[PDB]
Amino acid sequence: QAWQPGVAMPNLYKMQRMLLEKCDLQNYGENAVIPKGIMMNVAKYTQLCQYLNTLTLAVPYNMRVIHFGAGSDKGVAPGTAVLRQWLPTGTLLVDSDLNDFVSDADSTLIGDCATVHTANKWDLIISDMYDPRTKHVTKENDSKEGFFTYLCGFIKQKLALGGSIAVKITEHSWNADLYKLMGHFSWWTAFVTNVNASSSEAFLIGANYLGKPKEQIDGYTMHANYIFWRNTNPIQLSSYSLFDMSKFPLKLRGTAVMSLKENQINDMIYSLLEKGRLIIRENNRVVVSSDI
Amino acid sequence: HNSTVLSFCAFAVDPAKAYKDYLASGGQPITNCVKMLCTHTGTGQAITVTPEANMDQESFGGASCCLYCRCHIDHPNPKGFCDLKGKYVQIPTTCANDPVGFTLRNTVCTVCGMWKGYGCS
Ligand SMILES: C[S@@+](CC[C@H](N)C(=O)[O-])C[C@H]1O[C@@H](n2cnc3c(N)ncnc32)[C@H](O)[C@@H]1O
Ligand SMILES: [Zn+2]
Ligand SMILES: [Zn+2]
């Protein structure tokens, strides 16, 4: 486990029907396994990408990736820099944040995510959005809206079939509809980076979007399941995986992209999507705008 | 103190000279340049599409090491061009404490692709 980029929520825990409890994790100081001159977020995104390398991501010749919540207090975009490193050269990478920052993305959009519009579909959506103003361990823990409502809509409207997502959540920062949407992928988890394993943070990862239910997930229940897993399975901090970057870059799969009608999407092509040897979207000029 | 250095340079007629003066005054170099995890088996060239640090360098995200990006001011390049943003910069490890200053003070060899005086020829 220590050698892995992190730990994914086991099937056994996904399958429970737990009541929602408080998360008993806390995250002191200070990131004990981050190498001396490296940002936590560089380490975190590196392990996220390492984990994504283990899955059946579709990687088209002209891949499109959009990254929400890419800014930071530092005025720079560490996660974007890691994604740029990981993704194939020439990959279109657009990032965004409420607050101004400088980044290595091809385009950067400043503003609330709700102001971001695009008619084009995407192959991979990454979100590290998090509201700095929600209270830590308190009264109740209901499903959160805000940017989460936007993401659910964006996924449903703007994610290509076969595409994938990774969305940051925590004990308190989560949304029931997002969990439900996980049931519309070929596969999902549940991923905690080894470098931040003392935190209730995880990335909800949906691999190979199917645009229709594959399983019926209840969000309130699944988050309770997630919390129960975290509560009963301590994970020791580890940066082992950071010390071998030789196989880091996302594999150049040359994944077919096709525009297909609903009536053309049969069992054979669903199986390609699940495998994931196919992306279904148009290939029009990409226009992403922040207005207004 | 980062807020200050960035503003100090952003509101100078010659931001690069201002950064130099600021440093000579004992001011701290610009922080939060984004250091990448990498093999240290790269080509060692100055500015590359992916991290290319050799055993004597660190690789940083380019935009974070550019004074003009970081200060949110115009670049000195003829048109709207930054040679660092979107790319990675290899910085000698001995100079890794001040990547922005390094890129300001030095020049890339047009034949080697390596930093003049730090690996070129
Ligand atoms: C934990 S920080 C992300 C750090 C960043 N991913 C990195 O690589 O260092 C959370 C970010 O989400 C952003 N955010 C929160 N709500 C947002 C919203 N509604 N629209 C756009 N960005 C939002 C915040 O501005 C903040 O920059
Ligand atoms: Zn620049
Ligand atoms: Zn030379």
Author numbering:
A (entry chain A): 3 to 294
B (entry chain B): 9 to 129
From the paper:
Within one asymmetric unit in the crystals, one nsp10, one nsp16 and one SAM molecule were identified unambiguously. The structure of nsp16 exhibits the characteristic fold of the class I MTase family, comprising a seven-stranded β-sheet surrounded by α-helices and loops. Two zinc ions were clearly identified in nsp10, which formed the center of two zinc fingers, one coordinated by Cys-74, Cys-77, His-83 and Cys-90, and the other coordinated by Cys-117, Cys-120, Cys-128 and Cys-130. Nsp10 and nsp16 formed a protein complex through an interaction surface covering approximately 1767 Å2 in total, indicating a very stable interaction. Intermolecular hydrogen bonds exist between Gly-70/Ala-71/Gly-94 of nsp10 and Asp-106 of nsp16, Lys-93 of nsp10 and Ser-105 of nsp16, Leu-45 of nsp10 and Gln-87 of nsp16, Tyr-96 of nsp10 and Ala-83/Gln-87 of nsp16. The adenosine moiety of SAM is stacked among Phe-149, Met-131 and Cys-115 in nsp16 through Van der Waals force, and polar contacts also exist, such as those of adenine N6 with side chain of Asp-114, N1 with main chain of Cys-115, and N3 with main chain of Leu-100. The crystal structure of nsp16/nsp10 complex shows that the SAM binding cleft of nsp16 is composed of three loops: loop 71–79 (residues 71–79) together with loop 100–108 (residues 100–108) forming a wall on one side of the cleft and loop 130–148 (residues 130–148), which is followed by αD helix, forming a wall on the other side. In the crystal structure of nsp16/nsp10 complex, one hydrogen bond forms between Lys-93 of nsp10 and Ser-105 of nsp16, and two salt bridges exist between His-80 ND1 and NE2 from nsp10 with Asp-102 OD2 from nsp16. Both Ser-105 and Asp-102 of nsp16 are located in the flexible loop region 100–108, which stabilizes one wall of the SAM binding cleft, and consequently promotes the SAM binding activity of nsp16/nsp10 complex. In the crystal structure, the SAM methyl group stretches out to the surface provided by the K-D-K-E motif, which are located at the bottom of the central groove, and might bind the first adenine nucleotide, conserved in SARS genomic and subgenomic RNAs, as the acceptor of methyl group during the methylation.
